[PDB]
Design a protein around this nucleic acid. Sequence first.
RNA 1: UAGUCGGGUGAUUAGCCAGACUCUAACUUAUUGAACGUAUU
Lengths: 159, 528, 107, 103, 110, 210
Amino acid sequence: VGAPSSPVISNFCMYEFDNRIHAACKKVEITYTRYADDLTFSSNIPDVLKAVPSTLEVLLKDLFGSALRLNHSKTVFSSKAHNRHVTGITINNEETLSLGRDRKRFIKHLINQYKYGLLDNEDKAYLIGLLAFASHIEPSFITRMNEKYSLELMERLRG
Amino acid sequence: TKQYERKAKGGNLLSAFELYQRNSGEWFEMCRDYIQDGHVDESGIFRPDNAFYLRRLTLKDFRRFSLLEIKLEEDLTVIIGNNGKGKTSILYAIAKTLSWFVANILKEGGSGQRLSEMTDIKNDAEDRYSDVSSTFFFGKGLKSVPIRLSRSALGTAERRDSEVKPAKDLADIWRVINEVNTINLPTFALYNVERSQPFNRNIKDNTGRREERFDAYSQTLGGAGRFDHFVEWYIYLHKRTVSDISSSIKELEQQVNDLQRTVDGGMVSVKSLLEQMKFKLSEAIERNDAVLTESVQKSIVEKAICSVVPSISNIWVEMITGSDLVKVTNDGHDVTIDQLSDGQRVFLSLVADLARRMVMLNPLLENPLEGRGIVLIDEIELHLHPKWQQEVILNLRSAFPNIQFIITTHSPIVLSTIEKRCIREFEPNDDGDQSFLDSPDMQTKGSENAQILEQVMNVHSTPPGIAESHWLGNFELLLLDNSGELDNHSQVLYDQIKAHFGIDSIELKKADSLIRINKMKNKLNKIR
Amino acid sequence: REFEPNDDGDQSFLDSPDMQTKGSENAQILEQVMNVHSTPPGIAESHWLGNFELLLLDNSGELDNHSQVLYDQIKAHFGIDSIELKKADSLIRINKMKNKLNKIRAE
Amino acid sequence: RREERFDAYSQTLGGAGRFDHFVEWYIYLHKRTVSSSIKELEQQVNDLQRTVVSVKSLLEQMKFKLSEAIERNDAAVSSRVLTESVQKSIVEKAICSVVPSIS
Amino acid sequence: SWFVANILKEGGSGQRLSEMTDIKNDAEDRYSDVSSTFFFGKGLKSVPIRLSRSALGTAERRDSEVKPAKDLADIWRVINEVNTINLPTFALYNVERSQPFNRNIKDNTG
Amino acid sequence: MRELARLERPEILDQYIAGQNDWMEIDQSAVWPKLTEMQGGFCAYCECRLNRCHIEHFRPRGKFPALTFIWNNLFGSCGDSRKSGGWSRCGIYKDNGAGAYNADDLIKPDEENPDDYLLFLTTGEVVPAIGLTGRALKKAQETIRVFNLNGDIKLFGSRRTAVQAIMPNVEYLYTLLEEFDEDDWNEMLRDELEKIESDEYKTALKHAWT
RNA sequence: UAGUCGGGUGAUUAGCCAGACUCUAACUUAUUGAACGUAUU
Ligand SMILES: Nc1ncnc2c1ncn2[C@@H]1O[C@H](COP(=O)(O)OP(=O)(O)O)[C@@H](O)[C@H]1O
Ligand SMILES: [Mg+2]
Ligand SMILES: [Zn+2]
């Protein structure tokens, strides 16, 4: 994992796998993406995702034999009844990307601490970095924080 | 580190513990409060803020199962199916996983149990290895504790590794925190069909002390309990209670008071005995006066046994003959444990063993039987009459309200006392490729047993292999063939039904009903 | 050969049951031979259909506020196509017919 | 079995003088000797039975005493024996008198 | 057990009642009896057997009466010795039949 | 089974033609309203309440590819292979559980009256009707076998229990006949037969009443 | 009912308030490397 070439090689080695499974999923209206070793499937049709794990095992065996295998412990089904996230990003019930309530509340905590000069330099740097990420994932959250905390405070912080 | 500090302050148990270990106050107290905090509900039952239970189990190429997933209830899960559907396999798989927690609470880097390379791998599995994967939950601060036990078939050159470090990490928290400041500890137990054994009071285990707290984990997942250890422990408790002088004074004071009342009631024959007891009391008071925790422990267990075991109203130790004997009042008669029926003894053994362990592992609870843990019971109806089958689950759940029970049964009577959500059912022609187990469609709790037989257990309420079971059907068909009139053939069969089932039988009443209805229908047809 | 349930160990002879068991329904054997109720007595829901019947009998066979509540409870717990609900429905229908007969006779 | 006079001759000329047998015997005697006429005892047992919860332990003790008294009454002249309390005391005194530095 | 013992060996002894467990706790007479009657065709309509045991205190010994069992078993034994005959099967399967299988099969002592 | 009355074709079946199109393509939710109009929430073959349900090819798609988007051929059956495995009657059992069968030796509830062929005894068993020989007997016998109308214990048990619930009422109505006139009595029988139209196993209940 | 989503409030990772969701059914993860965001240039 630590080698600069390994990302490229790993993506290449999964090329044919991705071709086949993407095509198969598209026929049954399943969305498929892969982030390195993390495979994600989603659909609006009930009771179609149940067949996917079995399909995966067959394809892996076909292409790689016993070299690449599913981690069956990490196979997880979810829906709008439950928490849904993809690569550390929460998908809310309004079908929007979110940082999640807990992370948002933590950020608010840090801003409040900063407001009263209680944040140390390390925590301040941490806060700034995390706000940049927040701005990328959920720009509306930054707007709300500006409203809650005074644009002045937030601008001062981001200086 | 600052990252661990943030997570710990957010409520993560493992981060808090890591900080405690590196700085070795605040963090210790976080860990200890996580384990000990809880509240008493409206019903007066203590409830831990952070529950501990098995969430999910997955079996891959294990015995009959190619790939199987099971979601468990936090309180009660009942597994049902025909013989050979793998119900006992499921409890075995869980017990081996739990052995890793027990081993590591006892010893840093303790070794739990392993899957058999001779028997546990599925015989016709193309890959020659098996996996048992489990996830445990311990409050919102530790939502997932994943464990995997693995084994490759004998001979195979590639060997598949187990993954047990999360079990060890959690068990380390329990062990280390307990050593600094006592906490309540979880109970893990398996009661398989091996629990039905002949009793022997003469065989005693001279292997460890029974009063040592960690003896509660001794052979806890072996399948039989250790009822011998219970008896030894119970006699020990009795000797300590008798030897405690103030309780003896209180007991003697009570005896003197009872005897004084009898003498005041006109029984002059017991005056000599009263004088002797008064002297003994005076002597005891004169001897250097100082509540034993041992006395309370004894009382808790006695109540549990009497509440859960229907035929037992009292249990006590006698030494006066010159050998320590445990006696019970069974159906109004005082008997020794050796005199109990096998059914009564086996059930007593289960409850006694479990209660002992919970008392030893939960010293800080007002009611130690409200402690946490996972208990596995195979064939709960073993040796029980139908009358007892109607009470057994209710009694267990009331006595042990925070234990997660995972049980197997063949009894419709037991199922009639359980909600459908708790039931997991094998598909009828499975052959071990089914992927997920599900609950039955019918609500079982409060339902009639005959309905459960047919709708859940897939068995006819009347035995199809008995000819007499079909006579009413045949009778009806004959009646309908002869425009509703009793012909010679229908009369013969009627007489056979009457002769076989009797004049007051439900079957004969049904036949009579058929005659009446069909005669009336025919009369209507003629009028038309 | 059956023991009496209340046997305090002084029973002279063991005897055959009164009911024929061979080819009989399981529920009947439980009740008549083994002295066990068809529904578990320690569960409240086990009594609801019995109670429902009693309420129907108390209100001259008409479905009153109290009987309706219990009916709805039965329906909610056991389900739309449960045996218990069908029995309740049957009771309603038979009692309505019995009452109609009674009115015709009164007139 | 219950202890009987001619057990004194059992293994007397090989197998005698074994510590574990003593300890077991001694504890047994202690438990029995921890805490009257048969008719009087029968009457006391009957009175205590009528009263019978705190007196249940006393009833069991008295029933044992009655059974022992009947047994002694029933027992033969050839097997006449001293009370367990006396037996215990004699043995204790013997040990303390004979064994060096045990008082 | 008395039939089995005597089919195997002349004057073989079967199993006795226990003094500790088999006597009723509140038995006034302080002994127990098990009386059984067997049938073997019209030629031997009644084979009565009694097993008896007295409690420890022993006011009088009550002896078991097993001679008819022995006599019948002797017939089976002696006739079988001269010419092979078919013999009766006696078996008890109690709840002790539930027990784990040992894989280790003992090589053929014969 | 009940005699069914097929009204009118839904418009969606016009587009899809066999050979070009396959059954995965069509929207099932367009088709169901017309089936639910016909069948009334109950299974075609066993007459249980529909919960888990699927649209069923009377003559299957493998053996008869031509009969795929044909309105006669389709029926609403109990059970659904998507939701759960192990279903042991009606449409699923016809395909999987029952072996070889002649499709001509089956009662089709739109074409024919099943009351001609089948009889529902109050003990809960479906049997061929009295006085059938040769072809009519074979059809009655095979319809019972292939849809598993007795052999499924869940169904047998449920149908038996449904009928035995009403048998106090059947015996009570018919006793009141010497009491009452034909005009008032025939109303009450009609009132009871109106009720059972919205019940499970309505044919089995009819044969108990009439 | 429970669990989940989260707009607000709250010296704020808590608590409280409001609104909502429910295929049998999320468990928040990993750097110095790679990529992405921000800063510096
Ligand atoms: N290694 C194995 N490979 C295949 N089948 C096995 C293996 N081990 C056990 N079995 C089968 O699994 C079943 C064992 O049933 P068990 O787990 O005891 O279930 P139950 O308690 O429901 O009877 C039997 O059908 C047995 O033949
Ligand atoms: Mg970095
Ligand atoms: Zn159907």
